Amino acid sequence: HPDISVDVLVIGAGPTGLGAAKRLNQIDGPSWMIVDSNETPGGLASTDVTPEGFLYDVGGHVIASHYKYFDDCLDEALPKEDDWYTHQRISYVRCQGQWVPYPFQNNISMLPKEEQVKCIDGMIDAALEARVANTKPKTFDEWIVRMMGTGIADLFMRPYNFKVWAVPTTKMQCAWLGERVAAPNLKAVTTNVILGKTAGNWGPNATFRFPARGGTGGIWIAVANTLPKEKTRFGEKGKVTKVNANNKTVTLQDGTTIGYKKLVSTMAVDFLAEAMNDQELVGLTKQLFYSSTHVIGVGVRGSRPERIGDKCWLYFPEDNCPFYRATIFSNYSPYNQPEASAALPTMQLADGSRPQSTEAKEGPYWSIMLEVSESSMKPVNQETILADCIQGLVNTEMLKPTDEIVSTYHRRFDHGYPTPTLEREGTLTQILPKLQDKDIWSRGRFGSWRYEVGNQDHSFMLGVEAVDNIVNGAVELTLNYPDFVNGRQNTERRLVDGAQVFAKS
Amino acid sequence: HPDISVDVLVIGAGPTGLGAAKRLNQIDGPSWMIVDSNETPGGLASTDVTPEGFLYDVGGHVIASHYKYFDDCLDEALPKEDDWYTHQRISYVRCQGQWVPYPFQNNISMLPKEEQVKCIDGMIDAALEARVANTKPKTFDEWIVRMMGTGIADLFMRPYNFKVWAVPTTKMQCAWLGERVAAPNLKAVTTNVILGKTAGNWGPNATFRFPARGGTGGIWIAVANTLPKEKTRFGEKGKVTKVNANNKTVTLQDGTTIGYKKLVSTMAVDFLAEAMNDQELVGLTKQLFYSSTHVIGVGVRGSRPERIGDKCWLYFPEDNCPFYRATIFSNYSPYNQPEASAALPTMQLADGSRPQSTEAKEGPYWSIMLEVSESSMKPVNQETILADCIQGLVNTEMLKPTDEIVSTYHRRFDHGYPTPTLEREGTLTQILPKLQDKDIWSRGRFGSWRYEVGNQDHSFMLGVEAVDNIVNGAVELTLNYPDFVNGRQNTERRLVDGAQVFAKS
Amino acid sequence: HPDISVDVLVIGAGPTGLGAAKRLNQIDGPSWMIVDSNETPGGLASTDVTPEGFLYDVGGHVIASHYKYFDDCLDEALPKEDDWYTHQRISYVRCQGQWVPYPFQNNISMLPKEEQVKCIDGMIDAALEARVANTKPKTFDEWIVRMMGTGIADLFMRPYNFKVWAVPTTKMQCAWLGERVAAPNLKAVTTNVILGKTAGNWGPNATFRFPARGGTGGIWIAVANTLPKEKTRFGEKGKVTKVNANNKTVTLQDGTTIGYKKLVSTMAVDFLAEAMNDQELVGLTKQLFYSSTHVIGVGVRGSRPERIGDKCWLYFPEDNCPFYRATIFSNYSPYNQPEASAALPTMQLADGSRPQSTEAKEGPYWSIMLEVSESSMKPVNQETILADCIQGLVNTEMLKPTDEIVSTYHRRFDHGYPTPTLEREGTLTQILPKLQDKDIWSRGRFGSWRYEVGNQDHSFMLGVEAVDNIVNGAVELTLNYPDFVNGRQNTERRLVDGAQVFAKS
Ligand SMILES: Cc1cc2c(cc1C)N(C[C@H](O)[C@H](O)[C@H](O)COP(=O)(O)OP(=O)(O)OC[C@H]1O[C@@H](n3cnc4c(N)ncnc43)[C@H](O)[C@@H]1O)c1[nH]c(=O)[nH]c(=O)c1N2
Ligand SMILES: Cc1cc2c(cc1C)N(C[C@H](O)[C@H](O)[C@H](O)COP(=O)(O)OP(=O)(O)OC[C@H]1O[C@@H](n3cnc4c(N)ncnc43)[C@H](O)[C@@H]1O)c1[nH]c(=O)[nH]c(=O)c1N2
Ligand SMILES: Cc1cc2c(cc1C)N(C[C@H](O)[C@H](O)[C@H](O)COP(=O)(O)OP(=O)(O)OC[C@H]1O[C@@H](n3cnc4c(N)ncnc43)[C@H](O)[C@@H]1O)c1[nH]c(=O)[nH]c(=O)c1N2
Ligand SMILES: O=c1ccn([C@@H]2O[C@H](COP(=O)(O)OP(=O)(O)O)[C@@H](O)[C@H]2O)c(=O)[nH]1
Ligand SMILES: O=c1ccn([C@@H]2O[C@H](COP(=O)(O)OP(=O)(O)O)[C@@H](O)[C@H]2O)c(=O)[nH]1
Ligand SMILES: O=c1ccn([C@@H]2O[C@H](COP(=O)(O)OP(=O)(O)O)[C@@H](O)[C@H]2O)c(=O)[nH]1
Numbered sequence A, B, C: 001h002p003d004i005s006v007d008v009l010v011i012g013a014g015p016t017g018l019g020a021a022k023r024l025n026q027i028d029g030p031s032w033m034i035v036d037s038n039e040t041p042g043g044l045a046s047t048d049v050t051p052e053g054f055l056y057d058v059g060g061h062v063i064a065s066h067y068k069y070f071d072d073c074l075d076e077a078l079p080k081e082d083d084w085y086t087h088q089r090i091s092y093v094r095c096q097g098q099w100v101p102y103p104f105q106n107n108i109s110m111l112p113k114e115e116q117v118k119c120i121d122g123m124i125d126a127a128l129e130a131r132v133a134n135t136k137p138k139t140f141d142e143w144i145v146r147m148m149g150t151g152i153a154d155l156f157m158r159p160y161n162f163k164v165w166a167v168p169t170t171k172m173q174c175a176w177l178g179e180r181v182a183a184p185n186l187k188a189v190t191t192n193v194i195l196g197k198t199a200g201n202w203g204p205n206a207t208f209r210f211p212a213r214g215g216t217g218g219i220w221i222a223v224a225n226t227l228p229k230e231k232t233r234f235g236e237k238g239k240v241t242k243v244n245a246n247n248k249t250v251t252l253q254d255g256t257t258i259g260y261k262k263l264v265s266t267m268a269v270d271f272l273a274e275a276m277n278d279q280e281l282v283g284l285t286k287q288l289f290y291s292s293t294h295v296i297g298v299g300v301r302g303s304r305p306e307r308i309g310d311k312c313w314l315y316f317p318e319d320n321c322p323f324y325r326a327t328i329f330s331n332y333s334p335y336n337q338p339e340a341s342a343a344l345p346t347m348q349l350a351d352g353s354r355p356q357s358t359e360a361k362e363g364p365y366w367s368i369m370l371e372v373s374e375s376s377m378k379p380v381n382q383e384t385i386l387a388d389c390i391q392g393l394v395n396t397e398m399l400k401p402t403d404e405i406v407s408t409y410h411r412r413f414d415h416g417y418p419t420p421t422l423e424r425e426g427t428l429t430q431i432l433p434k435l436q437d438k439d440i441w442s443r444g445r446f447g448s449w450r451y452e453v454g455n456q457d458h459s460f461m462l463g464v465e466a467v468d469n470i471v472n473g474a475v476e477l478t479l480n481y482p483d484f485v486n487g488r489q490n491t492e493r494r495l496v497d498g499a500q501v502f503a504k505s
């Protein structure tokens, strides 16, 4: 008989595991506990800080919630109005010296006329083709072409998506983009060209909120703190090293064993297979594909430059920079970087030269967070990637050669994106049911490996729904039907349901 | 304070209400009770018996379950093997003296050559227009013409559907029919014409099980029996006369008042509106449409005729008989009619004449169940409908003129089919949300008025899911997404969920 | 025995009759003769002159030859290089107070931005519908909507075409327009909108030559002069009043009778029917439709204004003027108006007011020629149309209010355009064969009533080909296959054929 026994064991306290935990805690029926190898909950939704005081999420993290239940927990965790800042969803695409508003096609009036011709001609071809299309596109690349046409494809989505996914667009499926037909809005695009008009898809309605303190990682610390502490086990004392599926026991690094009746695993499914010592599942999970993420942070002296302004995130299809995305992280919260009165020396200038002085000087400061993808089809030289990113910032005119850099940050996250390869579903529909047969709910960004339901809210709800399936027999909608949950009003499930209202009488 | 107070009150003990009751009973949290004006539960899924011992369902009732939860409750209620009979579906459409395998549109091969031409020609035209169509059909009639062509429309779909729906095809929408109306495939249908092959396998009820005793009504009597008796109130004592939505109070016929927190109402929603004395709702519910159903039963002396054989239910598009469907109800169970030793006099011959004597002779007996529709667009002579049905049986060669009729049955059910009119959804989205904001869950065949989820399993699950939404914040999937629940295997929710398993440990 | 007998009689000495005459004269086999009621040959290709010395054609006459035979005869008649002036076509459409290069539909790029959107949107709809179309358009309006879209239809094609044809586009067929109405290309037109480029080169009259003296009418005077005088009878002495098709006898106004073996009649076919006293033919001809043309000429004092420049003819779709077209007739030849030293009093100022002086003053002079259509569907006030035209010139800024008018011209031509009505062909295939049976070749603009082969070269060749059929069994290609002769270079028939070469030895 094991050291600890519980009805439901949750491995991992990133968003998915915390969702499972929040729902278990709310139901307050079956016994449970949650473990994690990190002392700080949050997983890939955590936040780091540099010795100079610049915070960085694991790349650009922007919340777009599809669920009331997620809103209920975030509101419970950070309830005061100044626990959050609200921003319009402002983004641009860097293209031929221009910051083109997102989405790219509605803004090609900024491009040279010769290119507008090429773009509109291709989109005309695509519209005429879409009018008689009776088949669905099979690859990401076929979907891009059919929706954008050849010309607009080549400028943005094709070279951009290679830089994100670190695999070619011809190697990915396209079901993950949803059930909407790959077709051009030719009239809308052509109208903006005729009118010489730009127009981004943001505004008063198209907002996001960002935590005032602690970056994105602050949310999940705050949510985890609503859990009964004695049911949590975070740190080296919570690292799972062995899973015995046939015996329903888990072993921690410090030798502690935990018995379960149902297991919600939120670790990477390939790590799970290894921890189970199941050669068959190991072989199957190795057939999946993922890219690694390098996050580069650069802290800059100065008030925010006019050329930067209220930009939030930025896309980089071109090859004059290694990053696919930049975030003006200082625009998300004033507490993402030191106050103006904090004194820091200049480490270097953006062109790489030494500062004129070594003295500490005051701010204010602003901050850029960059993402570089890595895979076997796209290597990354870890020794030079920081300097390459900074050169990238000059090339894209985000930084002047003279701009003063006061903080740098680089970290590699091995499992960054679960790739929607052509083979992904063929592999997962083998892996997930074999685990399901052993009472293991493998869920999450890498627990279930589905990017289209791979955001914080999706993840959290994957945990919530898993628990609901285990206890109340609910359908796991987010797991199995991404287009469905992403397209509907998910308002039925709440942090206080009927069951708790009736029980309290 | 009212006489009785429950958290959830369930009005009606047909399948929908019994569903709510079963789930409320399983969950065993909030207090509840269920009321019906009938002493015998079952609603339109009940069974009558004639004084001569012939049972008749409310028209042809064949179970095709889309849900494990529904299976669990039927199996609990009738757990023995000899509680059920299994049957292969044998279904035909009567057309020009011939029997055409169901579905008609997939069996053009059995028609005379000249009618095959008209049908295939129409289907070729439809196929070619459909290759370039980029707008969905609006009405049932447009859908028919666009999916099958004019030949099949005129020969079968238009007269048949007026004859069952009691409105023309032009008056109905076409989003309800995914699992009711087969779309013919040009190549497949033409291939079977050339090869002279049938294709009678389409649809969810190609196999079915029928209760050995009590008809369909036996199921719901048995299901109801599994509930705690003290939480039920069936009979005159349970007839709801007033619903006061603002006070959350219901008044029964005997003056008993029941206070509730949440109301699941499964009575026809137009009745509910009247009971609420809500003139705005009465006005809205009157924009809905329904047809009435006459059920005619005919008991016949003799061993089962060869021309009848293993036939299950039969469709009649033609105007030489008033009924749209006949069921060989004696094929569903030996106990739907008397044993062969039972002595019964002949009441009349099928040709309408008196028999020679009043002598009670033995059997065996077989039995036909007929349905005639009625509406404000399709009047029915109540006084002659029985004799008209019997003559229809002679015209269609179901009965020989000399056949000996030993029992007759006729009953009119005012609310038979909830009609999928063009206006339905526009009216329902004014009605159901209004009731919802008063904490009223109106659900079921006439409770929420949606035929595409209007079968026994559907109904049962509307009640189940309503409770699950009330207690556990579940999505009401069957109510809002018929194609979704009709096209998947719904296996997640069970009579015993983890909740009950864990609570017993 | 009649007064005169010839093998072939030609009625009319417009271009069609002269064509018949020239071919008969070249062949020099059958005896022949040509009559006209007018002392001066030319018909609708004649030229009038005002007492002040301003010449006016019957509206805008620009030669675009499809035939080497036609060129041969023009070169014979006017052999000197200084008999002709060559011009580049400068043609615009008046829209929203600006000039848009002809053709409108290829020059969307010169419209105001909001109309560019309207136009391109319509063309996009048309392109998408044309992608799946399997039916040919039946009316002119349907053709416009299908080839150009609603934007161009409403802004230009519908109002402009009513303004010329004097019937709505819905009343006309669309088989006539191959070389009359440019079909815009979506990609090309959109490209030129993006690039702000013009495309003014469409169609056969992008370059033209105009006779140096006598206007267009001078060509036909000179061509007629090459005919042997004794075989011509022009004037009151050559007016046909009765045609006796059965006795093959024509009666002239002075009572002179002419016997023929074959008749080539170039007069309006309705007039021919009347001259034949053939009530069945009259009824048939009355099913045809034509519009009348008002020609208004305005002579203006002054050197050619900068705003006019090298403009040739100009289209006016809008309602601030009654004419559909203006020609800068003084640009076609310096001899279309008086020399600069000619003294002429001012008749009026363009704004209607009397001149400051009544004295004769010098030039130079320029000259405007206007056209206004009339029909039973578009009445015209004969008494005010001159003044209305002049005011229209002020409205469109063709004339300053202070411009001095020294000459005015107004003439109504009752048969101006043979309308391509829906009924035209149905009617003509009754008429022309019934005349063919009587050995009458009815040919020409109103002789055979087909606008698509209704220009001077077409007409001329209808006469030539008529004769060639009578004598040599040639196919009448221009008559029966307009798209055939308009789409090729017709080089085979020359003013000197092998026949004449071989015979001269
Ligand atoms: C570059 C980039 C950019 C974005 C995003 C991610 C990345 C990488 N996201 C996605 C977001 O980060 C993601 O949805 C969640 O972090 C997924 O959480 P999971 O809990 O499934 O696992 P995740 O990897 O977060 O957490 C898993 C947890 O399991 C633990 N674990 C692993 N092995 C263990 C073991 N053996 N024993 C014990 N514990 C173990 C880990 O410590 C970790 O805490 C996002 N989201 C969004 O809402 N908006 C956005 O804009 C973005 N953008
Ligand atoms: C002709 C025909 C044919 C078929 C079918 C129906 C009909 C009419 N059905 C559908 C099936 O009958 C249906 O799904 C259920 O009976 C509907 O369940 P409810 O609980 O919604 O309504 P239903 O009408 O069954 O039950 C409502 C109940 O509420 C009660 N009630 C009404 N007013 C009240 C009041 N004032 N107070 C208290 N109680 C009140 C009534 O007494 C009744 O018992 C079927 N299904 C299938 O699975 N296979 C099939 O082939 C068919 N075919
Ligand atoms: C407003 C407008 C604009 C244009 C044009 C016309 C008009 C009205 N044309 C067309 C051109 O004018 C036309 O092609 C010829 O004039 C037609 O020659 P027909 O000989 O068939 O008849 P046409 O009518 O020219 O000649 C008929 C002859 O028959 C004679 N006649 C009638 N009744 C008679 C009787 N009872 N007895 C004896 N003789 C009789 C008449 O006197 C007349 O001479 C043109 N062409 C072109 O090449 N380029 C252009 O841009 C244009 N544009
Ligand atoms: O051969 C057939 C018989 C029926 N139907 C259609 O199927 C529908 C459902 O009838 P069914 O008898 O399966 O169900 P019920 O009327 O008993 O609810 C009808 O409305 C018909 O339009 C069909 O398309 N082909
Ligand atoms: O065959 C029918 C006859 C009537 N109704 C409904 O009944 C309403 C009329 O209600 P009223 O109480 O005025 O009763 P009725 O007019 O039928 O006598 C109509 O609006 C319809 O919605 C129906 O659905 N089917
Ligand atoms: O910009 C323009 C001007 C004219 N037309 C069409 O061209 C036809 C022929 O007109 P045009 O001035 O060539 O010849 P005409 O009327 O003098 O015979 C007209 O009926 C118009 O419908 C056109 O499509 N675009």
Ligand SMILES: O=c1ccn([C@@H]2O[C@H](COP(=O)(O)OP(=O)(O)O)[C@@H](O)[C@H]2O)c(=O)[nH]1
Residues within 6 Å of the ligand: C285, C286, C287, C288, C289, C290, C291, C292, C374, C375, C376, C377
């Ligand atoms: O603008 C017009 C007016 C009349 N017509 C023709 O002239 C005939 C009418 O004849 P008319 O003016 O003699 O009157 P009606 O013969 O009917 O009395 C019509 O059938 C038309 O063919 C025409 O082509 N254009």
